[PDB]
Amino acid sequence: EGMWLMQQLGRKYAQMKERGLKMKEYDLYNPNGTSLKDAVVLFDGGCTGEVVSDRGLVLTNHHCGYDMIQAHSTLEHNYLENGFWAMREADELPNKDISVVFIDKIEDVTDYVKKELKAIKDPNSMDYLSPKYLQKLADKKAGKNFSAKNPGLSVEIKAFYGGNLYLMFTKKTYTDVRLVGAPPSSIGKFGADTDNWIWPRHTGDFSIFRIYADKNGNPAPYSEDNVPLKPKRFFNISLGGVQENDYAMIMGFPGTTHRYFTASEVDEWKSIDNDIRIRMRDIRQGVMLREMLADPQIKIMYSAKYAASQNAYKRAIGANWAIKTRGLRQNKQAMQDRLIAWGAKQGTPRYEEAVHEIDATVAKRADLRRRYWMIEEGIIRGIEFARSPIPTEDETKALQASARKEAIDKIRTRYSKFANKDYSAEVDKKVAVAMLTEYLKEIPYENLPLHLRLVKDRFAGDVQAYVDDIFARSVFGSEAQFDAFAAVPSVEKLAEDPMVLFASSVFDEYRKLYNELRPYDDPILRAQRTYIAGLLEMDGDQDQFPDANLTLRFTYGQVKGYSPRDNVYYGHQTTLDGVMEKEDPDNWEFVVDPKLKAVYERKDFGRYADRSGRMPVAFCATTHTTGGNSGSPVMNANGELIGLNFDRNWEGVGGDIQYLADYQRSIIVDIRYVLLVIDKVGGCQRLLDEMNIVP
Amino acid sequence: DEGMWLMQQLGRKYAQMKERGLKMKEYDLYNPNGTSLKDAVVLFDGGCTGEVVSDRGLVLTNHHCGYDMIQAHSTLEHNYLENGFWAMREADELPNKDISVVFIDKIEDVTDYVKKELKAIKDPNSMDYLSPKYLQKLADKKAGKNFSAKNPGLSVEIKAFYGGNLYLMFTKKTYTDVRLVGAPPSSIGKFGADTDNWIWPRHTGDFSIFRIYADKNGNPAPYSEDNVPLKPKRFFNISLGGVQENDYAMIMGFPGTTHRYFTASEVDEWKSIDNDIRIRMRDIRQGVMLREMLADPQIKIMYSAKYAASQNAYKRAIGANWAIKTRGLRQNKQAMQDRLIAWGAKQGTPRYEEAVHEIDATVAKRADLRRRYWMIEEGIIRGIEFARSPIPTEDETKALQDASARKEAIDKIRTRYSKFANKDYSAEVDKKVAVAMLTEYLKEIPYENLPLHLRLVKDRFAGDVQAYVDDIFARSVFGSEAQFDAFAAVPSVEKLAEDPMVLFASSVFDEYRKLYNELRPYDDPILRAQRTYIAGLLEMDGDQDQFPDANLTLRFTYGQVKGYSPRDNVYYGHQTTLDGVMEKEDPDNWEFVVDPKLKAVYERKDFGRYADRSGRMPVAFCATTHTTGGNSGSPVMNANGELIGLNFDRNWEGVGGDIQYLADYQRSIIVDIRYVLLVIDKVGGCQRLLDEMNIVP
Ligand SMILES: Oc1ccccc1CN1CCOCC1
Ligand SMILES: Oc1ccccc1CN1CCOCC1
Ligand SMILES: Oc1ccccc1CN1CCOCC1
Ligand SMILES: [Cl-]
Ligand SMILES: [Cl-]
Ligand SMILES: [Cl-]
After folding, report:
1. Element (DSSP H or E) covering residue A212
2. Which residue of B571, B577, B583 is in closest CB contact with A569?
3. Residue B586: CB within 6 Å of ligand 3?
4. Together in a domain, A237 and A269
5. 3-class secondary-structure state, position B141
6. At which residues is there a site annotated Is essential for the Asp/Glu P1 specificity of DPP11 (chain A)?
């Protein structure tokens, strides 16, 4: 059910032992010694990874290492397409701007932070949540020259439970992390967008890296003299596999949850955030799909844009399904009513006052938040010409020194980036006509961005004519129109340009709405500190975890499928047979790698197949995970690596607000499938040899 | 494999059925010389199955079987199709025009009689052995002179089985006064609508209720106000015990057609010609149609039924091709024919191998013609609406070329134009569909094989299909209402003889008929060789584990209540519940709206004695019985012969079951009788129907 702090392992240990955990408490997490926690890393600031060899080999997802694989890919050596397999350590590819963070130490500094906070003077100060203020406290506690006296180490204090608990983390960061291996994208991203958030899943979502360090294992930036890190702890790989009901646990860095939302915040999330994103993206995607299906060149240009829009669209659909069917609003209402009743009995009215402040703040910001989401989904991300060039103050104070050419070259560069090889003005006009029609129906005249008032005042309500006029008269409407402007440029032409006025007006309104809404966050945050303090005083910090905040957490559960709907059951494990069932040679997402197809046909599964002779691919578990847990190690009851978390099903996206025992599942790539791909597809035997594989 | 057994085969299957769970005595299910459960089964309205469930002639069948009768009695004031219908007294039950129920009174093996009559052969290649006219002459001879007049309501019919190796004579008792008694709203009767067609899990309460009326002595009589409900020989008892996983289940009904004795070359032809062409052409047609329906709400209204009708056989062809590709259908037919050829070589009889060779050679010879026939039928005859535009008849052309009969010819042509260009016809949508369909057709069919008018695409329009189609509508008398009216004011034969749409329609129909005429002779050598092929299979492995192809005659099938795994890590159980109906509810989607009375019954858990042991309300179940089209409305029986459900569909994964039964995928989709009784009781409030039924605890 939760994403527990490492400090909470002691309190949870007996429940974990009753669920199947076999390893000793301090072998998993030891606050003053080496433990399994020391083999977990925050991979590239947003993913999880794990050390799997005494030579610093690291496993993470394919979608986590995607940028590094793509940056090393060329037409001659397309690693993104065919995979990459370094046959020697010297062949492993260095990566610019990469990092791996180890959580060396974790310490509770709540009393220290609360004592420092007592010197505030302003009772409504937000320093208790300020990264700048908390970093000043972290530096004071660790010492002035801490990073100089302890090379590779840094300190950081984070707030938890809305500012009721503070932890200081001592982090060891390595920046020389080299690409070692990756399967082809046909394995690493098999389902591609069709199978995103989907269980059953047949994706071998993994990639392999290696941490490099100086001669003493200390962090060092990229250098040809760097040597593989000999870590103090690494995961043993299990080949025993998984069975239904087996204990499974994960360690990783979940990003964000909203477990302490009020019922009014659940209503706001559904009726504003989700409904607007769903409505606007459905319109945008609908026009885009029509144009992509009618022109093969439009499909090539808009495929990535369509896919990027669909990602949070599907998340919003899954979240709204949970709000509608799993009683999320009702459960938050019952939670706050229980605290209010308990507060009335104890004679402390501040908990009811805190819930009231949140409700009043949510109700007060409703129209502004609706206007913000409408402009953001409808125009800022919905219409491409909203991000068309806007002349700067320096560029206008150049067109009217001979830096007129410099001002024109800078504007030309931004025009070329806007109207790039993937931009279609005809597709954009069609999308804008549909998006603006919906926007103008939802936003009244007095709340419109100034330029949009011209739809009613100048074009008699004709959205098509307003959009046609923007492109017909704008210097950014076509290449020939920009070149005519660049030959005879004047600031009068730019100041009255219809596209410049549209872009400026919609961005002005977007910023103004952001500025008016920003002050509403603080009273909610301050009231949440009181609300969560009451919940912890009432029911204790035993069965209620702190919201995820990109810090190291553990979660446990079982390998278990679920019933998505009446008479339908999805089991706990998928097989290579399921990959072959989905193969479509003419559908780019479902092409199957010929080497993988041959391994399946010959049943060349070696020691990786299950007891039945079937080759496992992925499994699902009742662990509680979210974004940030991609690449997390999945452990056995013995702490051995059995898989890597890579996704969660759409039915469980509502799990960020309320964990859903009967629907929410972590989607995990089976470690047996990872080794089958390294061995039979990559032929990289040296990686298998350096891992400690247990029978 | 698991089949559609003749009633005659019950004796030799009885021990296997008993070992699979059957508890009733053999002659209580089927007795060739006395009353049995077979006497409670009817062929409903010539294409469905039904069953008698009371001593007063109450009949249950599917909602989609009784659909036309419910629709014919529906008005704006009393919309029975939308809200359901529940007659609260026998006098309130609605009579139906053109309805019938057929009882199979007697079934007799007349193989020796037919084979003796056939020996009076004038031509050894005669097809009289399969001729309904010839077989009816033999049936009348055996029954006697004026059988229908001497025994009113009774009629006789002989049918061929096993490719002409077995003949059965059926004595049928037909009743034509069958009145509508009850029907659930379409929200229950067709809950899944087109989305859930051929789909398991299924949550559709597909049932309707009728009553057989007869004269004072229970004899058939056309509709009369003096008619009285029929007191039948036998009726089904209703079981309330329900079903569990692995329970024995059996069905009796009228499966229409199967192709269990196809050669491997006929399976290849079915896949590579029939199915691939239908799939390709319908995907193009549906694609253009969907794009126009999504862009214009009025086009969606006009083309929704046409789109749905095209999708029905398209989905069936997809499901059939999935079985051919994944379930080794071609390989299993090949093994079957190779086993017969090996056995024939040991028996010293080469005629079985010669018969398979004749089928293979005939299939290979007709390949190009059959490809051309399917290409024109799917691509143009069905694919393009203006292919069925008016063509002036020989008498209409002769009338237009010195009498007042010219105005009659114009009125007849106008009537056909008004039917073609009706309220649902869009010339713009049709032109777009035709451009895409003709582009594919012209790519597949060479110039020398094209219908004459289509040669103009290359010869006159420089390969521009769009211009050719535009010219058809711009210059045709049937291109618009204003163009037809201009023709009707000044009509001439010369205008019609050179009309581009008339020439297109005539040319494509000429080619379609010519191809049909050239292909028709190839059917006979296959049929004659199939008689020899199936005789060999029967002689080799016996009439014990291989059933005759379905031919709209009474058959029984047995199996178990069992779900299946459609794909890796996915399992569909054996039973759906009312909770599944509520999960699918969408108030703004016509297909998935839920009746408020049903939703209230679910919320209050007012399930009475109809709920299962866990308090859940069952809706439908699936079984490993072998069914096909014609089995809609079939009674589903318990091990005791009690009614547990009505068959109403089969899953798409099992459509290949017409060629080879698929044990791990094919399932009959059945409405649970507990759900039927729940709807009659809590939704219709028709207690009198429950009271006349014999319900067993
Ligand atoms: O299989 C994939 C899945 C997701 C992303 C990319 C691929 C690779 N495809 C690239 C071009 O199309 C054929 C292979
Ligand atoms: O100003 C608001 C904005 C969003 C929500 C609620 C209000 C308060 N009221 C003002 C008067 O009109 C009725 C709503
Ligand atoms: O529920 C049905 C299922 C299939 C067909 C027809 C209906 C009835 N609907 C008609 C219009 O939409 C609301 C009811
Ligand atoms: Cl380390
Ligand atoms: Cl012979
Ligand atoms: Cl099968």
Report:
1. strand A207-213
2. B571
3. no
4. no
5. helix
6. 648
Three-state SS at A473: helix
Q: To the nearest 10°, the Cα dihedral for B504, B506, B509, B514?
A: -120
Q: Is B64 a catalytic residue?
A: yes
Q: Which atom of ligand 2 has the smallest separation from the CA of A363?
A: 5
Q: What is the rounded distance in angstroms from the CA atom of residue B171 to the CA atom of residue B104?
A: 6
Residue B268 CB contacts under 8 Å (≥ 6 apart), including other chains: B330, B363
Residue of B nearest to A572 (CA): B569
Which residues lie at CB < 5 A from ion ligand 4?
A: A 231-232
Q: What SS3 class is residue B505? A: helix
SS (H, E, C) B535-594: HHHHHHHCCCCCCCCCCCCCEEEEEEECCEEEECCEEECCEEEHHHHHHHCCCCCHHHCC
- Give buried/exposed letters for A338-354 (b at 16+ CB in 10 A, else e): ebbebbeeeeeeebbeb
In this structure, is the dihedral angle defined by the CA atoms of residues B577, B578, B581 and B582, taken in order, positive or negative? Answer: negative
By CB atoms closer than 10 A (0-12, 13-18, 19+), residue A333 is middle
Residues A405 and A503 in one domain: yes
Asked if residue B223 and residue B78 are part of one domain, the reply reads yes
* Residue A480: HSE in the Cβ half-sphere, 13 Å Cα cutoff: 3
Q: Cβ(A658)–Cβ(A88) under 8 Å?
A: no
- From CA A343, how far away is CA B373, in angstroms rounded? 82
Residues of A within 8 A of B573 (CB-CB) are 567-569
Give the rounded distance of the alpha carbon of A478 from its chain centre: 36
Query: Which of A195, A567, A612 is best to mutate for the B interface (most B CBs within 10 A)?
Result: A567
The amino acid occupying position B201 is P
CA dihedral of B239, B240, B241, B243, whole degrees rounded to 10: 80
Rounded CA separation B167/B162 (Å): 9
Number of domains in chain A: 2
- Return the amino acid letter for A192: A
State which approach was used to obtain the coordinates: X-ray
Give the range of the structural domain holding residue A304, as residue numbers without chain letter: 256-540
At a CB cut-off of 8 Å and minimum separation 6, what does B531 contact?
B129, B163, B164, B165
Residues paired with A160 in a beta bridge: A165
Query: Which residue in the block uniquely carries the two structure tokens 């990003």?
Result: A255
Residues A311 and A191 in one domain: no
What is the C-alpha R_g of chain B?
28
Give the end of a domain, one of A480, A509, A540. Answer: A540
Concatenating the DSSP letter of every residue in A354-380 gives: HHHHHHHHHHHHHHHHHHHHHHIIIII
**Which of the listed residues B490, B522, B542 is the one where a domain comes to its end?**
B542
Which tokens hold the place of A216? 């003493």
Q: Which ligand is nearest to the CA of B186?
A: 3
Side-chain half-sphere exposure of A333, counting CA atoms within 13 A: 9
Between CA A173 and CA A481 the distance in angstroms is 51
Q: What tokens appear for A657 in the block?
A: 């607000």
Please indicate, yes or no, whether residues A180 and A272 belong to a single structural domain of this protein. Answer: no
Beta strands in B94-176 (DSSP E): 101-109, 154-161, 166-175
> What SS3 state is found at B696?
strand
Residues in chain B within 8 Å Cβ distance of A581? 567-568
Q: Are B29 and B64 in a shared domain?
A: yes
Closest to B575 (Cβ–Cβ): which among A202, A567, A577? A567
Does the Cβ of A63 fall within 6 Å of ligand 1? no
Q: How many CB atoms lie within 10 A of CB B403?
A: 8
Q: Say yes or no: B404 and B550 in one domain.
A: no
Resolution in A: 1.9
| A647 lies in the same domain as A549 | yes
Q: Using an 8 Å Cβ cutoff, are B55 and B692 in contact?
A: yes
